Design a protein around this ligand. Sequence first.
Ligand SMILES: [Zn+2]
Ligand SMILES: [Zn+2]
Ligand SMILES: [Zn+2]
Ligand SMILES: [Zn+2]
Ligand SMILES: [Zn+2]
Ligand SMILES: [Zn+2]
Lengths: 76, 76, 148, 148, 124, 124
Amino acid sequence: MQIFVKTLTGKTITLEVEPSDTIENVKAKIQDKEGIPPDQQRLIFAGKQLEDGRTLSDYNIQKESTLHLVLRLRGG
Amino acid sequence: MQIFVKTLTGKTITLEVEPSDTIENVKAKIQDKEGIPPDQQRLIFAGKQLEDGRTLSDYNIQKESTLHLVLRLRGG
Amino acid sequence: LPRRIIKETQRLLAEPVPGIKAEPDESNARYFHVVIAGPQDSPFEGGTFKLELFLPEEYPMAAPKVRFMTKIYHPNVDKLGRIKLDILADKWSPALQIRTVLLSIQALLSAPNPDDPLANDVAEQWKTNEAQAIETARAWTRLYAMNN
Amino acid sequence: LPRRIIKETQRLLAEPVPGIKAEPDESNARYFHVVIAGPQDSPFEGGTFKLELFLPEEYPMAAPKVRFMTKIYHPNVDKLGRIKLDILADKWSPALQIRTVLLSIQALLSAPNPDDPLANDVAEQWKTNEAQAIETARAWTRLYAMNN
Amino acid sequence: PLCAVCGQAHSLEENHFYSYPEEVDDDLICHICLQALLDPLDTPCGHTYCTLCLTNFLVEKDFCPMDRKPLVLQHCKKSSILVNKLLNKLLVTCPFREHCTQVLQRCDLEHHFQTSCKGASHYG
Amino acid sequence: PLCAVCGQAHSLEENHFYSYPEEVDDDLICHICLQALLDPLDTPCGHTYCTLCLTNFLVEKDFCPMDRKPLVLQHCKKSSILVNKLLNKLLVTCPFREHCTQVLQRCDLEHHFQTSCKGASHYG
Ligand SMILES: [Zn+2]
Ligand SMILES: [Zn+2]
Ligand SMILES: [Zn+2]
Ligand SMILES: [Zn+2]
Ligand SMILES: [Zn+2]
Ligand SMILES: [Zn+2]
C-alpha cells in the first residue's frame, strides 16, 4: 500500500509502506524525503498523536490515508 | 529587441538587448544568467567569432537571432 | 499585513484540515475563529470546541496566541481557556505555521498530560482518578460542547 | 559506450547547429562525420568542408581528436588536415562538449591566426601577403570545397 | 515610495515583492517568509533562507529555525550556482499590469523596466 | 554482477544508473557525466558535481572544470538540503521491467526492491 504525509508547508508527499511498518519506520521515510530527523517529528492522524513503537496497523492507517507532520511537540 | 544565446549544454537563454549593445555588454548579461565571467566567454554567430569592442549592429545580429557560447578559445 | 500571514490564511481556506475549521475575522484579520473537533477515542468525542487564535504583530518571530473559548475539562487547559503547549512558547520556530499549532492542539485533546503548571485539581484528578476524569471530561463535552 | 557520449550524440541530432552537420558513424559510434559551412565574410564562403571527429576512450577527461578531410588553405590547419585550437589540447575541460569544439572550429575559419608553430609557408604567406592569401584560400575553397 | 528592482513598494529593510503566475516549487520557498527565495543563504546546518529573512531572525535569536542548531550568521554562505539559477529563471509578471502586460524571468525584470515598460516609464 | 541500490550493473567505482521517464532539469545535470546529480558536492568555486565525478577528475587534475579555478577536493562540501530534495524526488522507473513495471521517486527505489519488486525478488 501507499499513504500520504502532509508536510510542514502543505506540499503533500507519498510514502511506500505496508500495514506492519512501525511509526518509527515511517519517521525515517520522512527523513529521506524532507530532511527532518525522526526525533523532531510528530505524526497526527484523526486528532490522535501516532506513537513511535506502534504500527500503522495499530491506528487502522490503511491505503489512501493522510498523516500530518509537526516539528517536535510537548504539552505541559 | 531580444536575442537567443545557446549555452554550454544545449539550453537556449534569451537576452534583452538593442542594436548598439556591444558584445562586451552581451557577455556581462550571460554572466548574470549562467555565472560565467566575460573573460572566459567567446560568442560565435554564422561561423564568425564576435569581437568584444564591436556592436550587435556590426554583424547584423537582429531580433530572433541565436548566438552560440564557448568557454574561452585560442587558435595557435 | 505581512505577506506570509496572507499566504497561510489562503492555504487554510483552500487546503482545510479535517475536524479543524479556521476562518479569519472580519473586524481584524490577525485573528481567527477556530473550531476543533473532539477527537476519536478521546473523552471529548463529538464536541464542538471553539477557539480564538491571534497573531501578534511580531509574527512569526514570536508564536501565535491561542485560547479555548469552549469550556473543557482537561489538565493542559485552564479556567480562562489558555493552553499549555510548548510549540506555543518554549519550542516555537518560524518553521511552524498556524496549521501546525492547530494540529498539535488537536493532538493535546487526545493526549492530556497531567504534568501542567498545577492544572487545577483537574490534573490532580487526572493523575489520581483517570476513570472519573474521563467521565467528567465526557460530561463537559456533552454539557458544554454539543452545539446540538 | 559511456552514457555521456550517448546523451551528447542525441542533443546534436535533436538540437543541430546551423551550418554544422554532425552525424555519428555506423561502423563505430565514437567517430563522427562532420561537415562545416564556409562561413560568412571568410575567404572560405560557400565551401563544403568535411571533417572527421573522434572520441578517444578517455572521453571526456581527454578532448576529442579532430581532423579536416577537405583540403583548405589556412594557417591553423596542416597538410594532413589536423587543427591548432587550444580547446582541443591546452585548455580543454569536460565542461565542453562536441558542439563547442565544432563551433570553435567554425570560428577559426573566420579568424585564421598566422601564429602557428610554423603553419607552412602558408602562415608566412598570411602574415606577409593577406591580399593573396585571401585569394588563394578562395581558390582552395572553390577548387577543393564545392562538392559540385 | 516605489522600488527600483521589483516595481512594488517596500522599505529598504524588506525583501523584494514579485508576482509568480506559475506555481513555484515548495523546496524553493523560504521557510521564514513563505515566498520564493531571494539572495539565498545556505546555513552550515544545511538549510537555505533569504538573506534578510535569516539575518533578521539572527538579530535576536541564534539558531537554525528548523532543527534548533546554534547558528552564527557569519558562518552562512551564498547558495550554489545551481540554486541561484533555478530561482532566477522563475517567471514573474509585470507589476504595472494596467499599462504593461508582460511575463518574464525574475532576473530580467529590473532591466525590462528600463528597456520596454510603459508602466515603469510612466512610473506607476 | 548486479547492483544493490539501483538494480543496474556497474562497478563499485561507478555512479549509479537510473532511468528517468520524465525530463530532468538541466541545472540538476552534472557537467562531467551528462546525467542527473548523485551525491552532489558543491565546490568552493560555487559549482556542483557528483561526488565520484569530481573526485575522479581531481585524481589527476586540480581545477573546477568550468572556470579553471584551483580546487582541492578536501575543500568541497555536500550540497544544500534543498538541492538533495529536488534530486531525490525525481522519478525513476524500475530496472526490472520484464517482471515489475513501477514508476517511483529515486530515493525510494532501494527499498522498493526489498518490499514490492518481483524482479529484484527473482534477482534479474
Ligand atoms: Zn523591491
Ligand atoms: Zn524569506
Ligand atoms: Zn513591464
Ligand atoms: Zn548502483
Ligand atoms: Zn556526474
Ligand atoms: Zn520493481
